Amino acid sequence: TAVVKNLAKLPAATSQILTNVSKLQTFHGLLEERRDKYAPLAYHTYDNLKQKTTWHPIAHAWVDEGLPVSKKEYNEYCWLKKDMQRLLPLASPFVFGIYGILPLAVWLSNDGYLPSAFSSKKDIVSKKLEWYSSYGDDLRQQVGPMLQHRLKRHLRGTLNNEHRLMLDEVTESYKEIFYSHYTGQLRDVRKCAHLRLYDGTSTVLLLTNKEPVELTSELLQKWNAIKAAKLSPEEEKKARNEALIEAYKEQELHGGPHVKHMQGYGIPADTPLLGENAKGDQYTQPPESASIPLEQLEWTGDTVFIPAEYRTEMEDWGRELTKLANQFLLLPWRFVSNAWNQRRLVSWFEEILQEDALIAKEGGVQALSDDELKVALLDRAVIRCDEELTRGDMEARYKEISWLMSLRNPFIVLAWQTGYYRSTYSPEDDLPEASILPKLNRTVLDVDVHNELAPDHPEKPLPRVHPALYPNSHLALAKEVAVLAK
Amino acid sequence: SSPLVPVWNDLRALQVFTSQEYMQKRGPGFTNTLEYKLSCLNPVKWYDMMKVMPGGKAFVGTALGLALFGGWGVEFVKNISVMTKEKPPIDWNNEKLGHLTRS
Amino acid sequence: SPNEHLMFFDFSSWLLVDFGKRWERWVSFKKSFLTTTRSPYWSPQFFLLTFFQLRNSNVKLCENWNWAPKGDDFNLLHNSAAEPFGRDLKAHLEREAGAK
Amino acid sequence: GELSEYVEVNEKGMPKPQALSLWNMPYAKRRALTKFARGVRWQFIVLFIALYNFKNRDDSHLLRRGAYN
Amino acid sequence: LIPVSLVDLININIIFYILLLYTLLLFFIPLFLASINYTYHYIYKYYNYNYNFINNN
Amino acid sequence: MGGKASEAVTIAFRFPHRTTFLVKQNVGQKLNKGHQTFWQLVAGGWLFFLLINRTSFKPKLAAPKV
Amino acid sequence: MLNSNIYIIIYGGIIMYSIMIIIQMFLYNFSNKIYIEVEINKYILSKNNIDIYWIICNCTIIIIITTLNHIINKIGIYNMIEYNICYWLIGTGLGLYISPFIVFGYKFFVYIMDLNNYSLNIYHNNNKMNDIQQIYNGTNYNDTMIFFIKDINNIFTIYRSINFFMNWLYQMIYYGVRMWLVFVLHSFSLGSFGELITVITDNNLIFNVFYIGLLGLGFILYLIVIFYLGIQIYVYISFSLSFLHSTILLFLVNYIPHYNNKSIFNTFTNKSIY
Amino acid sequence: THAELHLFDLDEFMQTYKRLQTRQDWLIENKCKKSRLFSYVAAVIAFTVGKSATMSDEAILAKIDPYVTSEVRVQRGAWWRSGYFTKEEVEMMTPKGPIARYYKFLLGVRRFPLKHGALSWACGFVPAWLTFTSLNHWAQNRRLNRYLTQESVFGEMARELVRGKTADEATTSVMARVEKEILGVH
Amino acid sequence: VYTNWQSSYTRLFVSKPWMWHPLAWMTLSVGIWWKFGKESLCNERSFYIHT
């Protein structure tokens, strides 16, 4: 059986395990050496109830743009981290006793529970694909639908309170995202992005020596322009502070930052003077920084990200939804808080973003092979091995989820992913009949990301316009056109 | 509940805002005083400011206060209706019974 | 009768359980399990199966109460004793005279 | 309304009076009243009761032994 | 009266009654949940994506 | 007897603050960490504490010398 | 022997009488589900509604089933079970008591452990000295030399935290005792009147006849009994849930207004700046 | 891994015949109590030092910086408004305990950081668990050795059980001596 | 399609607090009996009160 088949190679596996541990140690040393000087400090923050940490990718998932590492090497890093996770049953005899060998036997029974060393294959890509096709796709295919249902019922709420909890403008997008297994039509990622309307406006407060300022597209454009100009720091900081005071005046004319009038957040006013400390009409006591002149406004280097996720936040998800998201992403989930599973999910998210960056450095998706792209999509959890799609469809799927994960929101990511895991079984043998049309094929051009899409009104859905029909499409798609024709 | 709740709320607000008024009046310089330098080395202050911290530290502080002092408090409450009661003399052990040679 | 309708006499038998013997057999089963498994002291099995018993026994042997509980050693109803003066002494002397 | 341990605040940062106003007296009188007050009421009552029963505790068990002879 | 009794306050017979009742309830929960709602039939029947095509001419 | 929720503040009044993720620029503060031999000495002190507080079970004291 | 400590357990007819109560739940099929849905959606709005709803459904349907078996299926325990105090305190009241602590136990526990750090609640708390007092001193109040009395303080603050969870226990006990008393006293009084009337008619056999009728009196008494007990059960349920609302569920009122989002297709990130 | 199995029956014997407990047996039990109580504090210290050996600077500043230790009571806007809190005010809001000072020293210490989760927690729990279990095991061993070297009824019972005899046989053998020498059988 | 309804009672129990309620009820009732009714009624030293 597989027990004796794996026991036969158990002696030959320890050397490979230790070699992999050495590679992991070297790689983590290198990566942390880079991270400890280029990456900022994402402080730990606690949930609304202030008992457990909460995690978000915008702050904690950092991408080393400029990482001198091969994509296959990063795949090795992540896969060996998962192998370290899978090596945990070796501690059972060292905590239970000599009778703690039966857990090790159960571990050695199934090959999917095991690390890389017990596999006959050599290449990391073929090895990962074997593991997925043997164990991982099956485990994910039995969690996908029930996670989709939990996400639905998290939006719409329980016990017939949809008229109190759902929104009437995201309705058609909700239907297209969650009930496309009924129609068989493809989905547009922008309709999944429309789910963020349940949340508020995500803001970024830059902390200065006087007051916090809300970041805008204009200020960000100016800062990117100044950073691209490659000026001396005496001019760089001056231009940055000029843009900063300009934006400060702009928001002061707007009526202050958006955070002042949001439930759960707020900026305090000047402190009050109590009793005899009140000096006539001056009932307030301004801060020390009020003495500083406004022309000396300088950025402290500190930032505060506020997703304002009132319905989407991972804190309010629950004990079950987090565990099922980690099952669906093949992460550890048992016997841990939702904060620890949140961190595991954010680490996976960061890995996927770093992998996207390295692919873009290595020349995009088309430079990859077919098996490598299949394994990438399996890691992204948008493909099941019982599909056998084309290369253009795989590339379009990757582009879709890459743009969707660029927004840094796990809820919409899971809503997108779970749609590709709704498979049925027929009770009859003759039905379903053999189709007559060819397989579904697409291209990178069919994905509309460079254009905005308004939310369709309820019970008034609009047809899908191809990007090619837009004006100047041959100009906008020229990069993708050159990449595909080449 | 009682109708004196707004009265107690007024008195609580009085003492709280008067303490804050006192802190405003005395202003800065508290860190240079001897009281602060002793509170920095005082375990009561450490426990009291760790109670309000996040990460389950309120539960930790409350349970620690229970395990340490609240048991003696429960015993004290049980002994309040025992102090006034007639009790007999303590039958002190003669410490003679129990000794036995080994074999 | 109404009380007969408010009565439950549908019992079948009395289950008699020697909880002392059952506790002894439980401890013996725990010892047998720990010996057969040859489990160390740092195991969660050993901890769960030994520590609470040892803690409770150590507490029940460390307890040194100056006085016993409330309804066992004081606060008890007692008839007033006979006084050595007045009417009680006269009754005592009259009893001694009548008996002798 | 009229919640427990709750108090509203006006634009001047002052507590609004729910039943009784006590902000007319001077700060010196308020500090005199509140320097010894705490956020605790019933524990002092229980403590005074315990001190009364301690003042009036029984010592018969010592009389039988001869600590007062 | 009979029910006015401290013996009937912590009756072990009724505690066994409750125990057996809720163990059987726990056993039979997955059969109580087996009632069908016809809401997804409605969603399948009535959900109609926009089927019109684009025609620039 | 006892109070009510109508006579008290809510779980939204308490804990009213939602979550804000603070981030700080990297100036180089977590570099040049000293005390490279700290954890070795810590483990040595821990094992020393365990050795001084160790007590082997000596059943030979129960031997029937009498 | 010395080690043998023997305990006697009084065992009777439990198994076959408890099986048919669960087996009847497939026949009833939760007929009270709509009523409890309406009441729960009146009193609270959260994702954990379904949990507490299901719990209440189970409790209520068990009550109803036991009551109907007590009225109709008169054998053994089904007669006593509604006349007994243990059923009214533990088989109906305890479940309703622990239901919110099982659904929203996390929030209530955190709330209680925060209330042990007792402090004055300020609306629009834009004060700075309040924060310094809360961090440095731990509370708004003056905590000088309370460590001198900490032993009582702990437990008193614990009671101060659960005082607003205690009236729920009180109301549950009160209404359980009320239902027990109602059933017992009404049954006893009715049976007593019946026995006195039968004594009068046995001593006067001109009247020892079916003077009202064989079915008339029985139907009327059936209607009286069922109407009265239905009123009492509706009272016990409606009051239990209204007091659940007014005592425990007003803590969980967290209304979030809907704020429109604008930056849907673009999100600022750590990489946008750094 | 063998003393607790005898100490169970010995403790049952002591609980039953608690009248036969001496002062030296009482002191042995009190010393075992002292060791058990100190084992909790030792476990807490080991847990702290282990998690601190795997906590990053952000996880440490979560416990030092009052921005994070004030999240329950204070608005975040009071910390975003520059000049709201003074330097001395932030200093009085910082924790002063020995753990805070240890972490403050540990800022400048090289370590092996991990992501905040189950492994950073297990690296503290495992040393704490081993410390607690080993201290209690050695305390019970010391207790049993003291009882075996104690010339008393409980010492005789412990000795007779350490020979390898059954609990019932040992109880009978010791009660045969108690009835004769101690109780003075008729 | 996988369901804990038909494939795992453990995950079904874990995913539903309204299934934990009867178990906690049982535990509390048995603990109440253990604390109060055991020694006062069922023990041989305290069984004559039924007379």
CSV table of C-alpha atoms in Angstrom, one decimal, chain A residues 63-372:
chain,number,residue,atom,x,y,z
A,63,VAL,CA,5.8,43.7,-2.3
A,64,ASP,CA,9.6,44.0,-2.8
A,65,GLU,CA,9.6,45.7,-6.2
A,66,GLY,CA,13.2,45.0,-7.1
A,67,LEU,CA,13.6,41.5,-5.6
A,68,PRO,CA,16.6,39.8,-7.2
A,69,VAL,CA,14.9,36.3,-7.2
A,70,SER,CA,13.7,33.9,-9.8
A,71,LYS,CA,10.0,33.0,-9.9
A,72,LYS,CA,10.8,29.3,-9.5
A,73,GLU,CA,12.9,30.1,-6.5
A,74,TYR,CA,10.0,31.9,-4.8
A,75,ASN,CA,7.8,29.0,-5.6
A,76,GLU,CA,10.3,26.8,-3.9
A,77,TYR,CA,10.3,29.1,-0.9
A,78,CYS,CA,6.5,29.0,-0.5
A,79,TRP,CA,6.2,25.2,-1.2
A,80,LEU,CA,8.9,24.5,1.4
A,81,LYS,CA,7.2,26.7,3.9
A,82,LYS,CA,4.1,24.5,3.4
A,83,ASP,CA,6.3,21.4,3.8
A,84,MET,CA,7.5,22.8,7.1
A,85,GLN,CA,3.8,23.1,8.0
A,86,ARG,CA,3.2,19.5,7.0
A,87,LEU,CA,6.2,18.2,9.0
A,88,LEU,CA,4.3,18.9,12.3
A,89,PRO,CA,3.1,15.3,13.0
A,90,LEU,CA,6.7,14.4,13.7
A,91,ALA,CA,6.2,16.0,17.1
A,92,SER,CA,3.5,13.6,18.1
A,93,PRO,CA,5.7,10.8,19.5
A,94,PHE,CA,7.8,13.5,21.3
A,95,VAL,CA,4.7,14.7,23.2
A,96,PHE,CA,2.5,11.6,23.5
A,97,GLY,CA,5.0,8.8,23.8
A,98,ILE,CA,6.0,5.6,21.9
A,99,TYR,CA,2.3,5.1,21.2
A,100,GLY,CA,2.3,8.4,19.3
A,101,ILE,CA,3.4,6.5,16.1
A,102,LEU,CA,-0.1,5.8,14.9
A,103,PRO,CA,-0.6,9.5,14.1
A,104,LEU,CA,2.6,9.3,12.1
A,105,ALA,CA,1.2,6.2,10.3
A,106,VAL,CA,-2.0,8.1,9.4
A,107,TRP,CA,0.3,10.9,8.2
A,108,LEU,CA,2.3,8.5,6.0
A,109,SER,CA,-0.9,6.8,4.6
A,110,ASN,CA,-2.0,9.6,2.3
A,111,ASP,CA,0.6,11.2,0.1
A,112,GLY,CA,-1.2,14.5,0.0
A,113,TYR,CA,-0.5,15.0,3.7
A,114,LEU,CA,3.2,14.7,3.1
A,115,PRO,CA,6.0,17.1,2.0
A,116,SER,CA,8.0,17.2,-1.3
A,117,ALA,CA,10.6,14.6,-0.3
A,118,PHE,CA,8.1,11.7,-0.5
A,119,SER,CA,7.3,12.5,-4.2
A,120,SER,CA,9.0,10.8,-7.1
A,121,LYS,CA,9.0,13.9,-9.3
A,122,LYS,CA,11.9,16.3,-9.4
A,123,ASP,CA,10.8,19.7,-10.8
A,124,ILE,CA,8.9,21.9,-8.3
A,125,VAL,CA,6.3,22.7,-10.9
A,126,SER,CA,5.5,19.0,-11.8
A,127,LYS,CA,5.6,18.2,-8.1
A,128,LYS,CA,3.1,20.9,-7.1
A,129,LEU,CA,0.9,19.9,-10.0
A,130,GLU,CA,1.0,16.3,-8.9
A,131,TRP,CA,0.1,17.2,-5.4
A,132,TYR,CA,-2.8,19.4,-6.5
A,133,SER,CA,-4.2,17.0,-9.0
A,134,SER,CA,-4.0,14.2,-6.4
A,135,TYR,CA,-5.3,15.9,-3.3
A,136,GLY,CA,-5.6,19.6,-3.4
A,137,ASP,CA,-8.2,20.2,-6.1
A,138,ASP,CA,-10.5,17.6,-4.6
A,139,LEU,CA,-10.2,19.2,-1.1
A,140,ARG,CA,-11.0,22.6,-2.6
A,141,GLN,CA,-13.8,21.5,-4.7
A,142,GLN,CA,-15.8,20.4,-1.6
A,143,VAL,CA,-15.3,23.8,0.2
A,144,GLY,CA,-15.9,26.2,-2.7
A,145,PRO,CA,-19.7,26.1,-2.9
A,146,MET,CA,-20.2,26.2,0.9
A,147,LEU,CA,-17.9,29.2,1.1
A,148,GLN,CA,-19.7,30.9,-1.7
A,149,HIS,CA,-22.9,30.4,0.2
A,150,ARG,CA,-21.4,31.7,3.4
A,151,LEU,CA,-20.3,34.9,1.6
A,152,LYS,CA,-23.7,35.3,0.1
A,153,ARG,CA,-25.4,34.9,3.5
A,154,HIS,CA,-22.8,37.2,5.1
A,155,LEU,CA,-23.8,40.0,2.7
A,156,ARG,CA,-27.6,39.4,2.7
A,157,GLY,CA,-27.7,38.4,6.4
A,158,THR,CA,-29.7,35.8,8.2
A,159,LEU,CA,-33.3,35.3,9.0
A,160,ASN,CA,-35.0,37.3,6.2
A,161,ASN,CA,-33.4,40.7,6.8
A,162,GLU,CA,-32.3,41.4,3.3
A,163,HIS,CA,-34.5,44.5,3.0
A,164,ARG,CA,-32.6,45.8,6.0
A,165,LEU,CA,-29.1,44.8,5.0
A,166,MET,CA,-28.6,44.5,1.3
A,167,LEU,CA,-28.3,47.5,-1.1
A,168,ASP,CA,-30.6,47.8,-4.2
A,169,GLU,CA,-27.9,49.1,-6.6
A,170,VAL,CA,-25.4,46.2,-6.3
A,171,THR,CA,-28.2,43.8,-6.9
A,172,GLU,CA,-27.6,42.9,-10.6
A,173,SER,CA,-23.8,42.7,-10.1
A,174,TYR,CA,-24.4,40.4,-7.1
A,175,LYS,CA,-26.6,38.2,-9.3
A,176,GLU,CA,-24.1,38.1,-12.1
A,177,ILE,CA,-21.3,37.2,-9.6
A,178,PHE,CA,-23.1,34.5,-7.6
A,179,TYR,CA,-25.5,33.0,-10.1
A,180,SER,CA,-23.4,32.7,-13.3
A,181,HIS,CA,-23.4,28.9,-12.8
A,182,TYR,CA,-27.1,29.1,-13.8
A,183,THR,CA,-26.6,31.0,-17.0
A,184,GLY,CA,-23.3,29.7,-18.1
A,185,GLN,CA,-22.2,33.2,-19.1
A,186,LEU,CA,-18.8,34.6,-18.3
A,187,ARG,CA,-18.4,37.2,-15.6
A,188,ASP,CA,-16.8,40.7,-15.6
A,189,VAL,CA,-14.4,41.5,-12.7
A,190,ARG,CA,-15.7,45.0,-12.5
A,191,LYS,CA,-19.1,43.6,-11.4
A,192,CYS,CA,-17.2,41.9,-8.5
A,193,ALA,CA,-15.5,45.1,-7.7
A,194,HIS,CA,-18.9,46.7,-7.4
A,195,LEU,CA,-19.3,44.7,-4.1
A,196,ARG,CA,-17.1,47.3,-2.4
A,197,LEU,CA,-20.1,49.6,-2.4
A,198,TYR,CA,-21.2,47.9,0.8
A,199,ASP,CA,-18.1,49.4,2.3
A,200,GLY,CA,-17.1,53.0,2.7
A,201,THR,CA,-14.4,55.0,1.1
A,202,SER,CA,-10.9,53.7,1.8
A,203,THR,CA,-8.7,56.5,3.0
A,204,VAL,CA,-5.0,57.1,3.7
A,205,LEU,CA,-4.1,59.8,6.3
A,206,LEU,CA,-0.6,61.1,6.1
A,207,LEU,CA,0.5,62.3,9.5
A,208,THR,CA,2.3,65.7,9.6
A,209,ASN,CA,3.8,67.9,12.3
A,210,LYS,CA,0.5,69.9,12.5
A,211,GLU,CA,-2.5,67.8,11.3
A,212,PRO,CA,-3.3,64.7,9.3
A,213,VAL,CA,-4.0,65.1,5.6
A,214,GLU,CA,-6.1,62.8,3.4
A,215,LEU,CA,-4.3,61.4,0.4
A,216,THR,CA,-5.7,62.0,-3.1
A,217,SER,CA,-5.0,61.0,-6.6
A,218,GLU,CA,-3.7,64.5,-7.4
A,219,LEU,CA,-1.2,64.5,-4.4
A,220,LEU,CA,-0.1,61.0,-5.3
A,221,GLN,CA,0.4,61.9,-8.9
A,222,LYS,CA,2.5,64.9,-7.8
A,223,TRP,CA,4.6,62.7,-5.5
A,224,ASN,CA,5.2,60.2,-8.2
A,225,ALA,CA,6.2,62.9,-10.6
A,226,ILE,CA,8.7,64.4,-8.0
A,227,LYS,CA,10.0,60.9,-7.3
A,228,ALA,CA,10.4,60.3,-11.1
A,229,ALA,CA,12.2,63.6,-11.6
A,230,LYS,CA,15.1,62.3,-9.4
A,231,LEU,CA,15.8,65.7,-7.8
A,232,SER,CA,18.0,66.6,-4.8
A,233,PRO,CA,16.3,65.9,-1.4
A,234,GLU,CA,16.4,69.7,-0.6
A,235,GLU,CA,14.1,70.2,-3.6
A,236,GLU,CA,12.2,66.9,-3.2
A,237,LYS,CA,11.1,67.6,0.4
A,238,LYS,CA,10.2,71.2,-0.5
A,239,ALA,CA,8.0,70.2,-3.4
A,240,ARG,CA,6.5,67.4,-1.2
A,241,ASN,CA,5.6,70.0,1.5
A,242,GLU,CA,4.3,72.4,-1.1
A,243,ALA,CA,1.9,69.8,-2.4
A,244,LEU,CA,1.1,68.8,1.2
A,245,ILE,CA,0.1,72.3,2.3
A,246,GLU,CA,-1.8,72.7,-1.0
A,247,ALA,CA,-3.8,69.5,-0.3
A,248,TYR,CA,-4.2,70.6,3.4
A,249,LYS,CA,-5.8,73.9,2.2
A,250,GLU,CA,-7.9,71.9,-0.3
A,251,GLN,CA,-9.3,69.6,2.3
A,252,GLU,CA,-9.9,72.5,4.7
A,253,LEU,CA,-12.0,74.1,2.0
A,254,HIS,CA,-13.7,70.7,1.4
A,255,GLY,CA,-14.7,70.7,5.1
A,256,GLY,CA,-12.0,68.6,6.7
A,257,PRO,CA,-11.1,65.0,6.0
A,258,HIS,CA,-13.7,62.3,5.3
A,259,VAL,CA,-12.9,60.7,8.7
A,260,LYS,CA,-14.6,63.5,10.7
A,261,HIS,CA,-18.1,62.4,9.7
A,262,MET,CA,-17.8,58.6,9.8
A,263,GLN,CA,-19.3,56.5,12.5
A,264,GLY,CA,-16.6,54.6,14.4
A,265,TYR,CA,-13.8,57.1,13.5
A,266,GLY,CA,-13.2,60.7,14.3
A,267,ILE,CA,-10.8,63.6,14.8
A,268,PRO,CA,-11.1,65.3,18.3
A,269,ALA,CA,-11.6,69.0,18.5
A,270,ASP,CA,-9.5,71.2,20.7
A,271,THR,CA,-9.7,70.0,24.3
A,272,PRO,CA,-12.1,71.8,26.7
A,273,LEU,CA,-11.2,73.9,29.7
A,274,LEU,CA,-13.1,72.7,32.8
A,275,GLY,CA,-14.6,75.1,35.4
A,276,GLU,CA,-12.3,77.8,36.6
A,277,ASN,CA,-9.7,76.9,34.0
A,278,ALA,CA,-12.1,78.3,31.4
A,279,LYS,CA,-10.8,81.8,30.7
A,280,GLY,CA,-14.0,83.6,29.8
A,281,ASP,CA,-15.0,82.9,26.3
A,282,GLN,CA,-12.0,80.7,25.4
A,283,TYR,CA,-13.5,77.3,26.3
A,284,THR,CA,-10.8,75.5,24.4
A,285,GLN,CA,-7.1,74.7,24.7
A,286,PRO,CA,-5.4,74.3,21.3
A,287,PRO,CA,-2.4,71.9,21.0
A,288,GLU,CA,1.2,72.7,21.0
A,289,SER,CA,1.5,72.4,17.2
A,290,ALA,CA,-0.9,75.4,16.8
A,291,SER,CA,2.2,77.5,17.6
A,292,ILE,CA,4.1,76.1,14.6
A,293,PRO,CA,3.5,78.2,11.4
A,294,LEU,CA,1.7,76.4,8.6
A,295,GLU,CA,4.6,77.1,6.1
A,296,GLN,CA,6.7,74.6,8.1
A,297,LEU,CA,4.2,71.7,7.4
A,298,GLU,CA,6.3,68.6,6.9
A,299,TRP,CA,5.4,65.0,6.5
A,300,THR,CA,6.3,62.9,9.5
A,301,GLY,CA,6.8,59.8,7.4
A,302,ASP,CA,3.8,58.1,9.2
A,303,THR,CA,0.7,56.8,7.4
A,304,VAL,CA,-2.7,55.5,8.5
A,305,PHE,CA,-4.7,53.2,6.2
A,306,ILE,CA,-8.4,53.1,6.9
A,307,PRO,CA,-10.4,50.6,4.7
A,308,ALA,CA,-13.7,51.7,6.3
A,309,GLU,CA,-15.0,48.1,5.7
A,310,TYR,CA,-18.2,48.2,7.6
A,311,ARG,CA,-19.6,44.9,6.1
A,312,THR,CA,-16.5,43.4,4.4
A,313,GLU,CA,-14.0,43.5,7.3
A,314,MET,CA,-12.4,40.3,8.2
A,315,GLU,CA,-13.1,40.9,11.9
A,316,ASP,CA,-16.9,40.6,11.4
A,317,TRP,CA,-16.6,37.5,9.2
A,318,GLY,CA,-16.8,35.0,12.0
A,319,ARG,CA,-15.4,31.7,13.2
A,320,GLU,CA,-16.7,29.7,10.2
A,321,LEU,CA,-16.1,31.9,7.2
A,322,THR,CA,-12.4,32.4,8.0
A,323,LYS,CA,-11.9,28.7,8.4
A,324,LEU,CA,-13.6,27.9,5.2
A,325,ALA,CA,-11.6,30.5,3.3
A,326,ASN,CA,-8.4,28.9,4.6
A,327,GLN,CA,-9.7,25.5,3.6
A,328,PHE,CA,-10.5,26.8,0.1
A,329,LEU,CA,-7.0,28.3,-0.1
A,330,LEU,CA,-5.5,25.1,1.4
A,331,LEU,CA,-4.1,26.9,4.4
A,332,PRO,CA,-4.0,25.7,8.1
A,333,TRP,CA,-7.2,26.4,9.8
A,334,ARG,CA,-7.8,24.1,12.8
A,335,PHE,CA,-7.8,25.1,16.4
A,336,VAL,CA,-6.7,28.7,16.0
A,337,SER,CA,-8.2,32.1,16.3
A,338,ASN,CA,-9.5,34.1,13.4
A,339,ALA,CA,-6.6,36.5,13.9
A,340,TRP,CA,-4.1,33.8,13.2
A,341,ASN,CA,-6.0,32.5,10.2
A,342,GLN,CA,-6.3,36.1,9.0
A,343,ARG,CA,-2.5,36.4,9.2
A,344,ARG,CA,-2.1,33.2,7.3
A,345,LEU,CA,-4.4,34.5,4.6
A,346,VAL,CA,-2.6,37.8,4.4
A,347,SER,CA,0.7,36.0,4.1
A,348,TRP,CA,-0.6,33.9,1.2
A,349,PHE,CA,-2.0,37.1,-0.3
A,350,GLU,CA,1.5,38.8,0.0
A,351,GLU,CA,3.1,35.7,-1.6
A,352,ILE,CA,0.7,35.9,-4.6
A,353,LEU,CA,1.4,39.6,-5.1
A,354,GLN,CA,5.2,39.1,-4.9
A,355,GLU,CA,4.8,36.2,-7.4
A,356,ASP,CA,2.8,38.6,-9.7
A,357,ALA,CA,5.6,41.2,-9.4
A,358,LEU,CA,8.3,38.6,-10.3
A,359,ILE,CA,6.2,37.3,-13.3
A,360,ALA,CA,5.9,40.9,-14.5
A,361,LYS,CA,9.6,41.3,-14.2
A,362,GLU,CA,10.2,38.0,-16.0
A,363,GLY,CA,8.0,39.1,-18.9
A,364,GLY,CA,4.4,38.5,-18.0
A,365,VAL,CA,2.4,35.3,-18.4
A,366,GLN,CA,3.3,34.5,-22.0
A,367,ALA,CA,6.9,33.8,-21.0
A,368,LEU,CA,5.6,31.0,-18.8
A,369,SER,CA,5.0,27.4,-19.9
A,370,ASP,CA,1.6,25.7,-19.9
A,371,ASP,CA,2.3,23.6,-16.8
A,372,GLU,CA,3.7,26.6,-14.9
